[PDB]
Amino acid sequence: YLTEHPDPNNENIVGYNNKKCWPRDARMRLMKHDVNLGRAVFWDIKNRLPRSVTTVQWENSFVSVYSKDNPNLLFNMCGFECRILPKCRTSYEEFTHKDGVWNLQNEVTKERTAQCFLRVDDESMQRFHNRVRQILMASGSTTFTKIVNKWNTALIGLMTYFREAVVNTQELLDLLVKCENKIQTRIKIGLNSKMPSRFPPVVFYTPKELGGLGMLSMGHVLI
Amino acid sequence: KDKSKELHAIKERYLRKFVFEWDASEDTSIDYNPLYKERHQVQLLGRGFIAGID
Amino acid sequence: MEQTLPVTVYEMDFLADLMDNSELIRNVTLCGHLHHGKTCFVDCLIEQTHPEIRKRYDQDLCYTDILFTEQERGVGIKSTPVTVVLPDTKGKSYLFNIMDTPGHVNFSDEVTAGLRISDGVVLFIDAAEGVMLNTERLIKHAVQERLAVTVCINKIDRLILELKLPPTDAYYKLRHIVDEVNGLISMYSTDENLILSPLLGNVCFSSSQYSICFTLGSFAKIYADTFGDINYQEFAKRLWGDIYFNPKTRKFTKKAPTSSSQRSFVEFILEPLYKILAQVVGDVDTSLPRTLDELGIHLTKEELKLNIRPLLRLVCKKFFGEFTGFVDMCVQHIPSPKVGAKPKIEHTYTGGVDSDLGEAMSDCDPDGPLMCHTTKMYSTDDGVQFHAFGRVLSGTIHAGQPVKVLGENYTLEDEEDSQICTVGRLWISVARYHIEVNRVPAGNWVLIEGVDQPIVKTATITEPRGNEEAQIFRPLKFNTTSVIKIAVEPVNPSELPKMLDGLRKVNKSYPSLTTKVEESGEHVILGTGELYLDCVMHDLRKMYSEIDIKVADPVVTFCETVVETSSLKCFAETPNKKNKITMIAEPLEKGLAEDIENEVVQITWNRKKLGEFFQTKYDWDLLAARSIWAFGPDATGPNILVDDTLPSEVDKALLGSVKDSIVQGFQWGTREGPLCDELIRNVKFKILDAVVAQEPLHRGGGQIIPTARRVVYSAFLMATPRLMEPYYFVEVQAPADCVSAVYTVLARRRGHVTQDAPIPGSPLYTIKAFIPAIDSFGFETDLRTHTQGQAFSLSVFHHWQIVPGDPLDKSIVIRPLEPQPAPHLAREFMIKTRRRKGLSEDVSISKFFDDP
Amino acid sequence: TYQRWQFTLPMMSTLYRLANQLLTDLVDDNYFYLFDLKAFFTSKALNMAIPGGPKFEPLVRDINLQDEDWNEFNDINKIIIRQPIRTEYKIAFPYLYNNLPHHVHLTWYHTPNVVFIKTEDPDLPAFYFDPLINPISHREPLPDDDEEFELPEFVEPFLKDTPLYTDNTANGIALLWAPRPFNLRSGRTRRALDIPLVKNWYREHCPAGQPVKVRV
Amino acid sequence: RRSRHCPYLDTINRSVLDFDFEKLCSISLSHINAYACLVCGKYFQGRGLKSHAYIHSVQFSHHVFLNLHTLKFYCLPDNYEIIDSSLEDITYVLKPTFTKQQIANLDKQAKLSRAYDGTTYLPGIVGLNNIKANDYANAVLQALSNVPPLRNYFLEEDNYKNIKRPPGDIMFLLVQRFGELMRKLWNPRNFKAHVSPHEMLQAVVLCSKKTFQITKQGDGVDFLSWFLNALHSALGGTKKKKKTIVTDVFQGSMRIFTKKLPHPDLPAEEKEQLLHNDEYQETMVESTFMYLTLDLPTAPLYKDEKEQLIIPQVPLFNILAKFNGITEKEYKTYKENFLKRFQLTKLPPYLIFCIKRFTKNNFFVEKNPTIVNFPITNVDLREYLSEEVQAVHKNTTYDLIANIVHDGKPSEGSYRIHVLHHGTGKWYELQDLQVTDILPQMITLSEAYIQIWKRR
Ligand SMILES: Nc1nc2c(ncn2[C@@H]2O[C@H](COP(=O)(O)OP(=O)(O)OP(=O)(O)O)[C@@H](O)[C@H]2O)c(=O)[nH]1
Ligand SMILES: [Mg+2]
Ligand SMILES: [Zn+2]
Incomplete structure (x- = not known):
C-alpha cells in the first residue's frame, strides 16, 4: 500500500x-x-x-x-x-x-x-427525533387521539427493535423523555393557551377504552 | 479530600431577573494547594503597611 | 563599503586603520550574574562614542537585548557583539571588541561561545548582592578557559540610596566582595600571580545607571586636574587599603592618627561621592547651586529643572566624564592579543602549539594562512539565512574569496566534513547596525555571509590549495549539561517539513541545543531549563517555522549504573561461532567518574603517567593500571574498560589486532545502554577472557562490534542495575522572613536544604538546596507566587543521583495517572521511558544472552 | 490657567506624609508577579483564571479535550506525573506548556529586589547601620610608612566643609521610592475625574479572610 | 582493493528504494553527507566512525550505502567504495541525466519502457500521486510536460544552473524542483510507473505563501497563470531578462482596441458629440498575453427540439470570433463601459486557451456546461490576424496536444487531462494515478477547460 x-x-x-x-x-x-x-x-x-x-x-x-x-x-x-x-x-x-x-x-x-x-x-436516534418532529409539525389541526396514537406507534417500534441498546444508551433515554414532554405540552396547549402547573397524569395515561388517551410511557412519572 | 481533588484535577486536565449582587458561584481562588490557600502575606520589613487598613 | 552609518565621535576610517595594528585591539567579554548591569554599561559606552543615540530618562535603553522576546521578558537571551574605539585616560585610543553575554544561569552556552573567541573577561558584580551563583560559576569557567579576569563592582549607588550605609561600612562591604572574589580565584586556579585588588588596577567601581565609572587612577586624575601638582599614579597607589591620611604632615601612614581618622579611600573617594549624591537628591533647591559652584559644574536652568533621577545622572556625568577607568583596566590587564595568541592556540587548537601552523598562528600576523574560527550563528530578521560570527586568528578574510569550511567531525584522515564555499560579504557588527567592510585582518571579530550551509554549531575556515595539514579547533566544552527534554509534533501533519526546517534553524541558533529523532519517530529537544525551552519554543513557533506545534510535557534524561559486581561472568560468541568474548562489570570508586569527566585524567596521557596516577590515587595495582583501554562513550566518559586477561591464556598481539573493534563496541554499548537506551555512568567493564579467530576476514568488522556490545549489555544486566537521576542545585535569594516559606516549598518537592545564610551588609538571605530535576518543574513559580514575589531562585544541574527504587522489578504495578510513591519510582521511570523510546515493554536479563 | 506646577522637596515630603493612608508602601513591582495586565491578557487569551483574577468568555472557540482521539503523541500511558500543571505554570511559560498559544503575552521576569531601609525615627543620622542590615563580620600590597610621598598643602577632600547629611536627606531618599506622583518634583494638572483613588487598592491581592461578596 | 568483490551486493532490493523525497538524515535531520541504505531505503548521516550510517550498518547488518550527493557506493562498517556496473540503474533512477542525442530522439520512441516491476509504460505518460487535494496542480504540471521546447529546456540542468539569483531568493526552488520533476517524469528506466510531486508542491506552497495548498484545491487557471509568471520571473536572473524560455514558448502579443462607450444613460445628441471628444475613440494598447481567455455564451435557459440532448454546444470558431477586428467584447467596469476589440499580432508556437468555465453569479459560482465543438488535427487561425502580419507569419495551423478538463460540481471538482503522445499519435487520458487510452473522436465531447495547441 x-x-x-x-x-x-x-x-x-x-x-x-x-x-x-x-x-x-x-x-x-x-x-x-x-x-x-x-x-x-x-x-x-x-x-x-x-x-x-x-x-x-x-x-x-x-x-x-x-x-x-x-x-x-x-x-x-x-x-x-x-x-x-x-x-x-x-x-x-x-x-x-x-x-x-x-x-x-x-x-x-x-x-x-x-x-x-x-x-x-x-x-x-436522529431518525426517531425527526419522526417526532414531523408528528408535531403535521399535528396542526389534527386530534389528540391521533397524536397519541402516532406517539405510541413510534415508541413501540423503537423499543421493540432496539431492546437492550436503549437501556445501554444514556442519551436515548433523555431524548425519549424530552419527546414525551413535548407531546404532553402539545396536548396541554391544545387544551388551553396558558400553561398550567402540576397537570394530572391520569388523562394522559388512562386507557383509551376508559376515556383516557392510552398514552405509552417510557420515563419515571410519579403519581 | 485534597488528594482526591488533586487526582480529579489531573484526570479532568488530561482525559430577566435583575441581579445587583454577583453570585458566589462566580468566585475564583478556591484552590487545594495550601501554598496557594495560605500565601504568606508580605511583611515590608515591619515598617511598611497596607493602604486603608487601620 | 560606503554604506550609511550613524554619526560617531570617532570615524570608521580610523577604525579600519586601527584593525590592521593588532597591538591596539582588545577582545573582552562582559559576563556576570543576572541583572547586574552589563547591558546598561555597554549602552552607556555606546552613548559616549555615539552622541546621537541616548538612553531614555524614565526607560533604560539597552542597544543590546534587541530581540522581541528580550525586550518583553526583560532578560538577556543572546550574546551581542560590539566594536568601539574607546579613549584611554592618557588620551590614546584603542579598539574594543566587547561581547556582552546574558546572565541567566540557563544561557551559559552563550557565555562559553563568547569566551571561546574572547581574550579577557570583565566580571560585573552588584554592590548590594555581591558574589552569587553565576559569578562563582563564571569565575570557575574563565580560570579554566585560561582567560585574564578583571572585575567591575557595579551598582555602587545601592549602598548610598537604598542601604544608606555609612561610608566606612560601604568600604567594608566592597572590601568583603573583593575578598570573596580573590578566594574563589585562588581556589579554582593554582597560580597565585592572578590577585585582584584595586591597588593593582584589576577592580573598577561603577554605577551604570547614573553613568559613574572610575578607578583609583581616574579619581586621582580628577584630583590632579583640579590641583595640578600631584602624580595621580602615586596618589592611586596610596589611596585604597588601610592607609590613613595625616594632614599635619600631609603624608599617608599605615598607622591611624587620632584613632578616628578614616582611611584614605573613605576620605577622598567615598565620602565626597556620598556628599554629591545626598546634595543632589536632598537639597536640590537650597544648596545644590553652591555645591555645583564648588565642583565647577555649570548646568542650565532647563537642565536643573529635571526630576531627581535624571538630574543625578546629568550631574554625575558632568562631574566624571568618560569611562576611562574601564579602558585603563582592560588595556593594562588583558593580552594584546598578539601576546595572548599563544595560550589561545595552546588550549583550543587540536593540532597543538608545537605544530608549524601552531607557530604561524601564535605569531598572529595579518599576512599568513587563513585560520578563522566561527562559534556563533546569527539569523537575519527574516529568519532565512544565518551569518557566521567568529574570530580571525591568522591571515585576512576577503569578500568574495572562496574558502574551505571544516566542521567538527573533520580529521586529517576523513576529509569529507569540509566544503568549499564563497564568502559573500563582511561586516564589523556594532550591536544594532553592521558596518560592511571588504576585508578583515587577523585578530578581529567578523560576521561572514555565505558559509552557513555546511556548519551546524562550530567550524573553522581556511583557504583551499593551502594549509593541507590543517586541523579543526576543539569543539566548545560547555559549563553544564542539557537535561530537560521535550517532544514536539506539528498540529497538521501536512506541515511537517516546515517544522523540520524550524528545528534545524533553532539547532543552529542555540549553541547547546540537541535535537534528535527517536526510534518511534518522536522529535525530541534537550534544553537546560524551563526558560531556555520556553524561548526555544517561541522562536521555533514564531520566527523560523510559521506553523502551530504541539509540545509534550517536560521530562528529564536518566542514566543507568550498577551497584555491585556481576553475579556471574558472562560471554558471547560471534555469528561465525569463533571470536568468543567474556566480561564482568562492577562499580567504579567514588570520585573517579568526576576525575575522568573533569579531565584530571586523559587517555591521551603516556601509559607511564596514567598508570602512576591510577596506582597512587585510587589504590590500583600497576598491572591493572596499565591495562586501560577506553573511557566510556567519549574519550572522557564516566565508565572505564580494562582487560584482565593474562598473556598466558591469550595472544596479546591478537588482542591488539581486535582492540579497536572491541573498543568501538564497548563505546557504542555504553552510549546506548540496555535498560532504557540511555548513557551508562560510573561502571568498570573488565574483559576476563577472549578467544580470537586467527584470520582477519574471520574477525573484525561486523563480527566483533555487535558481539562486544551484546557482551557489555549482558554484563551490565547481570550486575544489579539501577537508574540515575539528575539533581539541580537551587539558590534562592529571599528576605530574612520568607526563609520558612522557602523551606516549606522545597520540602514539598523532595528538596533538601543544604544551607541558609545571610548576605553580610544586606537585609537578605541566601538559601542553597538540592532538588530533583524532574520535580523541579514549576518550582520557581510556585515559590514566587507563594511568597508574593519577594523570593527568587535560580537552578542549575549539579550531579547525578540514584533513583530510590529498583528498576528491574516486575512485581510493582503502575497506574497510568498517579504520582507513585518513592520505592518504585525507578520502575515507573524505566517502563515509561521505554514506552517513550518505543522499545519492548520490558527487558529480561537473558534478552541479550546467547543461550536463550 | 492652573496648567502646570513645580513643587519643592519639603512640600512633596509633607504631601506624601499626609497622603500616606492611601498608599501601600510598596517599593517594587515584584508584588504583581502574575497579577499584572500582561498576565491577565495571557489568562484571557488562554481561557483560564488566575486564582484571584478575572474570568472572561472564551476568546476563541475552546478545544474540547474529549474530542482528540488518543494518538501516539497524547498517549496517557507514557506520561510521568509528579505535580499537576496548574494554570500559573502555563501563564508564566505560555509557549512551553500550551498548544496553540495565540495572542499570548510574555510576562516581565524578575526585577532585582529593592532593599530600602525605611526610617522610623527621624532623630537618627541620615546614613546609619540599621539593625535590619545583616552585620559585616570583619575578618595587602601596602607601601611602607617610611616612604616619602607628601601631598601639597592646597589638596584636601573635595567637599570637606559641606556636611555629609542635612535635615532633609532621608526625606529625599524616601521620595526617590515614593509611588507616583510623589516621586516627581514637577508636572501637569489632571482632572478630578481623571484621578482615581482606589485603583491601586483593587489592583492588589485581596486581603486575607474577607467575605465572598467583597472577593468577587 | 576488495572492491568489485563485495559479498553483500545481493542483499540490495530495488523494491524499497524510493528517491522521491527530501534527502536528510533520518535521525539528525541534517542535509550534510547523506547516505541511503540500499537494504531498507532509509537516509542517514554519512560514513566515518560513530556516524549514524556506520552505527546503523553494524546494528542492522545493512552493509551497503550510497552517497546521495556523489553517487558512489560504500560498504560499512569496513569502508571501501564498491565498483560494479550492475548498480548504475540505482544511480540513474536517483539522478537522471539526458544527453543531447537522447533529448533529440525523445519524441520518436514507439516502444514501451518497463519499470523494475513488471509494469509497462511510456515516458511522459506517467501518473502523478495525489496527496489530499492535488488534482489541479497535477493536471497543470502534466500539461506543461508534453511541451517539447520547455521540456527540452528543463531536462538539462546546466541550462539554468548558472543563472544568477539574489541572496534570499526562494523562487528558484520552483525552477530547480520543476527540473527535477521533469527529469523524473521523462526517466525511461524508472522503478515505478508513477511519481510523487510532493517536493514540487511543497515548494509551490512555500513560494505562493499558503495560496495553492495541497489540502485544498484551487483554480486550475489561476495556478497556471501564477506558475507561468513565477517561472518567468525566476528565470529572469537579477533582472527581467526580456526573453526567458517561458516567454519564447508561450507568450504572444495582441493589439487591444479600447473604445470607451460615451455613456449608457445619455441622450443621443450628447452621445454622438462625445465621439469627437476622442476619449471615447479607438485607442491601441498593444500588450502581451501568456494565454487567451475565451468566454462561453451563457446556457440557453430552455431546451430545444434539435440536438435533443439538454446539453448545449458552441463552435470553437464561434468562440474565437472574438479576437477578430470585427467582433466587439463589452467590458463593463463600474460607472463605465468599454467596447473592446482585439487583433492578434504575434502567435506563440505553443498557444494556450483557458476557457472561462466557472463564473460567479449573484448568489454562488456556476459551471457553464456548454461544450465547445473543436477539431483536433487542424485549425487555421490565419483569418484572425491582420494582413500586415499574415505575410510575416508562415505557419498558422494549430493542433491540439493537451486538454485539461474539469468534471463535477464547483465544490467536488476533479481534473483529468487528455494528452497526445508523440512518437505514436495516441491520446491518453490521465487522472491522478490512472492512465487510460482514449479515442481521438471522444476528446471534443468533454468540457474543455484548458487547451495547449502546437503550431507545427
Ligand atoms: N540601582 C541601580 N540599578 C541598575 C544600575 N544599572 C543597571 N540597573 C538595573 O539593573 C537591571 C538590569 O539591567 P541590565 O544591565 O540591562 O541587565 P543585564 O546586565 O544585561 O543582565 P541580563 O538581563 O542577564 O542580560 C535593570 O532593571 C536596571 O535598571 C545601577 O547602576 N544602579
Ligand atoms: Mg544583557
Ligand atoms: Zn538499513
Missing part, C-alpha cells in the same frame, strides 16, 4: 473515521501500524471492484483494527453499534449483569471469552 501511495509525513491519521459515541479509551486508538493497516486493507478491497460498476468511498466507510495496541473491536450493523472486548485483554475485572452487554462465550468449551457492548446508532 505504501509503495503505491507513499506517506512521508505520517498523514494517514488526519482523515481517519472514528466512532465518536464511545469514550476515548473505548474508541479505536490511532497507532502508526494500525492506521496504515486499515488504510492498506481498504485500498486493497477498493482495487478489486471497477470504478465503473460501483465505487467504495472511504468517507462513508469505517475500518477498525484490533491488535496488540487496540483492545476493542468496533462496528456498526443494522442500526446497532457493537463493541467487542475480550476477557483476556484489558478486562482484568469482575462483571455483573448489565442490560446492554452480551456475554459472548466460547461455544465448544462454554467459557466466557468476550463481552459485546451495544448502543443505538446516532443515525437511528
Whole structure:
C-alpha cells in the first residue's frame, strides 16, 4: 500500500473515521501500524471492484483494527453499534449483569471469552427525533387521539427493535423523555393557551377504552 | 479530600431577573494547594503597611 | 563599503586603520550574574562614542537585548557583539571588541561561545548582592578557559540610596566582595600571580545607571586636574587599603592618627561621592547651586529643572566624564592579543602549539594562512539565512574569496566534513547596525555571509590549495549539561517539513541545543531549563517555522549504573561461532567518574603517567593500571574498560589486532545502554577472557562490534542495575522572613536544604538546596507566587543521583495517572521511558544472552 | 490657567506624609508577579483564571479535550506525573506548556529586589547601620610608612566643609521610592475625574479572610 | 582493493528504494553527507566512525550505502567504495541525466519502457500521486510536460544552473524542483510507473505563501497563470531578462482596441458629440498575453427540439470570433463601459486557451456546461490576424496536444487531462494515478477547460 501511495509525513491519521459515541479509551486508538493497516486493507478491497460498476468511498466507510495496541473491536450493523472486548485483554475485572452487554462465550468449551457492548446508532436516534418532529409539525389541526396514537406507534417500534441498546444508551433515554414532554405540552396547549402547573397524569395515561388517551410511557412519572 | 481533588484535577486536565449582587458561584481562588490557600502575606520589613487598613 | 552609518565621535576610517595594528585591539567579554548591569554599561559606552543615540530618562535603553522576546521578558537571551574605539585616560585610543553575554544561569552556552573567541573577561558584580551563583560559576569557567579576569563592582549607588550605609561600612562591604572574589580565584586556579585588588588596577567601581565609572587612577586624575601638582599614579597607589591620611604632615601612614581618622579611600573617594549624591537628591533647591559652584559644574536652568533621577545622572556625568577607568583596566590587564595568541592556540587548537601552523598562528600576523574560527550563528530578521560570527586568528578574510569550511567531525584522515564555499560579504557588527567592510585582518571579530550551509554549531575556515595539514579547533566544552527534554509534533501533519526546517534553524541558533529523532519517530529537544525551552519554543513557533506545534510535557534524561559486581561472568560468541568474548562489570570508586569527566585524567596521557596516577590515587595495582583501554562513550566518559586477561591464556598481539573493534563496541554499548537506551555512568567493564579467530576476514568488522556490545549489555544486566537521576542545585535569594516559606516549598518537592545564610551588609538571605530535576518543574513559580514575589531562585544541574527504587522489578504495578510513591519510582521511570523510546515493554536479563 | 506646577522637596515630603493612608508602601513591582495586565491578557487569551483574577468568555472557540482521539503523541500511558500543571505554570511559560498559544503575552521576569531601609525615627543620622542590615563580620600590597610621598598643602577632600547629611536627606531618599506622583518634583494638572483613588487598592491581592461578596 | 568483490551486493532490493523525497538524515535531520541504505531505503548521516550510517550498518547488518550527493557506493562498517556496473540503474533512477542525442530522439520512441516491476509504460505518460487535494496542480504540471521546447529546456540542468539569483531568493526552488520533476517524469528506466510531486508542491506552497495548498484545491487557471509568471520571473536572473524560455514558448502579443462607450444613460445628441471628444475613440494598447481567455455564451435557459440532448454546444470558431477586428467584447467596469476589440499580432508556437468555465453569479459560482465543438488535427487561425502580419507569419495551423478538463460540481471538482503522445499519435487520458487510452473522436465531447495547441 505504501509503495503505491507513499506517506512521508505520517498523514494517514488526519482523515481517519472514528466512532465518536464511545469514550476515548473505548474508541479505536490511532497507532502508526494500525492506521496504515486499515488504510492498506481498504485500498486493497477498493482495487478489486471497477470504478465503473460501483465505487467504495472511504468517507462513508469505517475500518477498525484490533491488535496488540487496540483492545476493542468496533462496528456498526443494522442500526446497532457493537463493541467487542475480550476477557483476556484489558478486562482484568469482575462483571455483573448489565442490560446492554452480551456475554459472548466460547461455544465448544462454554467459557466466557468476550463481552459485546451495544448502543443505538446516532443515525437511528436522529431518525426517531425527526419522526417526532414531523408528528408535531403535521399535528396542526389534527386530534389528540391521533397524536397519541402516532406517539405510541413510534415508541413501540423503537423499543421493540432496539431492546437492550436503549437501556445501554444514556442519551436515548433523555431524548425519549424530552419527546414525551413535548407531546404532553402539545396536548396541554391544545387544551388551553396558558400553561398550567402540576397537570394530572391520569388523562394522559388512562386507557383509551376508559376515556383516557392510552398514552405509552417510557420515563419515571410519579403519581 | 485534597488528594482526591488533586487526582480529579489531573484526570479532568488530561482525559430577566435583575441581579445587583454577583453570585458566589462566580468566585475564583478556591484552590487545594495550601501554598496557594495560605500565601504568606508580605511583611515590608515591619515598617511598611497596607493602604486603608487601620 | 560606503554604506550609511550613524554619526560617531570617532570615524570608521580610523577604525579600519586601527584593525590592521593588532597591538591596539582588545577582545573582552562582559559576563556576570543576572541583572547586574552589563547591558546598561555597554549602552552607556555606546552613548559616549555615539552622541546621537541616548538612553531614555524614565526607560533604560539597552542597544543590546534587541530581540522581541528580550525586550518583553526583560532578560538577556543572546550574546551581542560590539566594536568601539574607546579613549584611554592618557588620551590614546584603542579598539574594543566587547561581547556582552546574558546572565541567566540557563544561557551559559552563550557565555562559553563568547569566551571561546574572547581574550579577557570583565566580571560585573552588584554592590548590594555581591558574589552569587553565576559569578562563582563564571569565575570557575574563565580560570579554566585560561582567560585574564578583571572585575567591575557595579551598582555602587545601592549602598548610598537604598542601604544608606555609612561610608566606612560601604568600604567594608566592597572590601568583603573583593575578598570573596580573590578566594574563589585562588581556589579554582593554582597560580597565585592572578590577585585582584584595586591597588593593582584589576577592580573598577561603577554605577551604570547614573553613568559613574572610575578607578583609583581616574579619581586621582580628577584630583590632579583640579590641583595640578600631584602624580595621580602615586596618589592611586596610596589611596585604597588601610592607609590613613595625616594632614599635619600631609603624608599617608599605615598607622591611624587620632584613632578616628578614616582611611584614605573613605576620605577622598567615598565620602565626597556620598556628599554629591545626598546634595543632589536632598537639597536640590537650597544648596545644590553652591555645591555645583564648588565642583565647577555649570548646568542650565532647563537642565536643573529635571526630576531627581535624571538630574543625578546629568550631574554625575558632568562631574566624571568618560569611562576611562574601564579602558585603563582592560588595556593594562588583558593580552594584546598578539601576546595572548599563544595560550589561545595552546588550549583550543587540536593540532597543538608545537605544530608549524601552531607557530604561524601564535605569531598572529595579518599576512599568513587563513585560520578563522566561527562559534556563533546569527539569523537575519527574516529568519532565512544565518551569518557566521567568529574570530580571525591568522591571515585576512576577503569578500568574495572562496574558502574551505571544516566542521567538527573533520580529521586529517576523513576529509569529507569540509566544503568549499564563497564568502559573500563582511561586516564589523556594532550591536544594532553592521558596518560592511571588504576585508578583515587577523585578530578581529567578523560576521561572514555565505558559509552557513555546511556548519551546524562550530567550524573553522581556511583557504583551499593551502594549509593541507590543517586541523579543526576543539569543539566548545560547555559549563553544564542539557537535561530537560521535550517532544514536539506539528498540529497538521501536512506541515511537517516546515517544522523540520524550524528545528534545524533553532539547532543552529542555540549553541547547546540537541535535537534528535527517536526510534518511534518522536522529535525530541534537550534544553537546560524551563526558560531556555520556553524561548526555544517561541522562536521555533514564531520566527523560523510559521506553523502551530504541539509540545509534550517536560521530562528529564536518566542514566543507568550498577551497584555491585556481576553475579556471574558472562560471554558471547560471534555469528561465525569463533571470536568468543567474556566480561564482568562492577562499580567504579567514588570520585573517579568526576576525575575522568573533569579531565584530571586523559587517555591521551603516556601509559607511564596514567598508570602512576591510577596506582597512587585510587589504590590500583600497576598491572591493572596499565591495562586501560577506553573511557566510556567519549574519550572522557564516566565508565572505564580494562582487560584482565593474562598473556598466558591469550595472544596479546591478537588482542591488539581486535582492540579497536572491541573498543568501538564497548563505546557504542555504553552510549546506548540496555535498560532504557540511555548513557551508562560510573561502571568498570573488565574483559576476563577472549578467544580470537586467527584470520582477519574471520574477525573484525561486523563480527566483533555487535558481539562486544551484546557482551557489555549482558554484563551490565547481570550486575544489579539501577537508574540515575539528575539533581539541580537551587539558590534562592529571599528576605530574612520568607526563609520558612522557602523551606516549606522545597520540602514539598523532595528538596533538601543544604544551607541558609545571610548576605553580610544586606537585609537578605541566601538559601542553597538540592532538588530533583524532574520535580523541579514549576518550582520557581510556585515559590514566587507563594511568597508574593519577594523570593527568587535560580537552578542549575549539579550531579547525578540514584533513583530510590529498583528498576528491574516486575512485581510493582503502575497506574497510568498517579504520582507513585518513592520505592518504585525507578520502575515507573524505566517502563515509561521505554514506552517513550518505543522499545519492548520490558527487558529480561537473558534478552541479550546467547543461550536463550 | 492652573496648567502646570513645580513643587519643592519639603512640600512633596509633607504631601506624601499626609497622603500616606492611601498608599501601600510598596517599593517594587515584584508584588504583581502574575497579577499584572500582561498576565491577565495571557489568562484571557488562554481561557483560564488566575486564582484571584478575572474570568472572561472564551476568546476563541475552546478545544474540547474529549474530542482528540488518543494518538501516539497524547498517549496517557507514557506520561510521568509528579505535580499537576496548574494554570500559573502555563501563564508564566505560555509557549512551553500550551498548544496553540495565540495572542499570548510574555510576562516581565524578575526585577532585582529593592532593599530600602525605611526610617522610623527621624532623630537618627541620615546614613546609619540599621539593625535590619545583616552585620559585616570583619575578618595587602601596602607601601611602607617610611616612604616619602607628601601631598601639597592646597589638596584636601573635595567637599570637606559641606556636611555629609542635612535635615532633609532621608526625606529625599524616601521620595526617590515614593509611588507616583510623589516621586516627581514637577508636572501637569489632571482632572478630578481623571484621578482615581482606589485603583491601586483593587489592583492588589485581596486581603486575607474577607467575605465572598467583597472577593468577587 | 576488495572492491568489485563485495559479498553483500545481493542483499540490495530495488523494491524499497524510493528517491522521491527530501534527502536528510533520518535521525539528525541534517542535509550534510547523506547516505541511503540500499537494504531498507532509509537516509542517514554519512560514513566515518560513530556516524549514524556506520552505527546503523553494524546494528542492522545493512552493509551497503550510497552517497546521495556523489553517487558512489560504500560498504560499512569496513569502508571501501564498491565498483560494479550492475548498480548504475540505482544511480540513474536517483539522478537522471539526458544527453543531447537522447533529448533529440525523445519524441520518436514507439516502444514501451518497463519499470523494475513488471509494469509497462511510456515516458511522459506517467501518473502523478495525489496527496489530499492535488488534482489541479497535477493536471497543470502534466500539461506543461508534453511541451517539447520547455521540456527540452528543463531536462538539462546546466541550462539554468548558472543563472544568477539574489541572496534570499526562494523562487528558484520552483525552477530547480520543476527540473527535477521533469527529469523524473521523462526517466525511461524508472522503478515505478508513477511519481510523487510532493517536493514540487511543497515548494509551490512555500513560494505562493499558503495560496495553492495541497489540502485544498484551487483554480486550475489561476495556478497556471501564477506558475507561468513565477517561472518567468525566476528565470529572469537579477533582472527581467526580456526573453526567458517561458516567454519564447508561450507568450504572444495582441493589439487591444479600447473604445470607451460615451455613456449608457445619455441622450443621443450628447452621445454622438462625445465621439469627437476622442476619449471615447479607438485607442491601441498593444500588450502581451501568456494565454487567451475565451468566454462561453451563457446556457440557453430552455431546451430545444434539435440536438435533443439538454446539453448545449458552441463552435470553437464561434468562440474565437472574438479576437477578430470585427467582433466587439463589452467590458463593463463600474460607472463605465468599454467596447473592446482585439487583433492578434504575434502567435506563440505553443498557444494556450483557458476557457472561462466557472463564473460567479449573484448568489454562488456556476459551471457553464456548454461544450465547445473543436477539431483536433487542424485549425487555421490565419483569418484572425491582420494582413500586415499574415505575410510575416508562415505557419498558422494549430493542433491540439493537451486538454485539461474539469468534471463535477464547483465544490467536488476533479481534473483529468487528455494528452497526445508523440512518437505514436495516441491520446491518453490521465487522472491522478490512472492512465487510460482514449479515442481521438471522444476528446471534443468533454468540457474543455484548458487547451495547449502546437503550431507545427
Ligand atoms: N540601582 C541601580 N540599578 C541598575 C544600575 N544599572 C543597571 N540597573 C538595573 O539593573 C537591571 C538590569 O539591567 P541590565 O544591565 O540591562 O541587565 P543585564 O546586565 O544585561 O543582565 P541580563 O538581563 O542577564 O542580560 C535593570 O532593571 C536596571 O535598571 C545601577 O547602576 N544602579
Ligand atoms: Mg544583557
Ligand atoms: Zn538499513
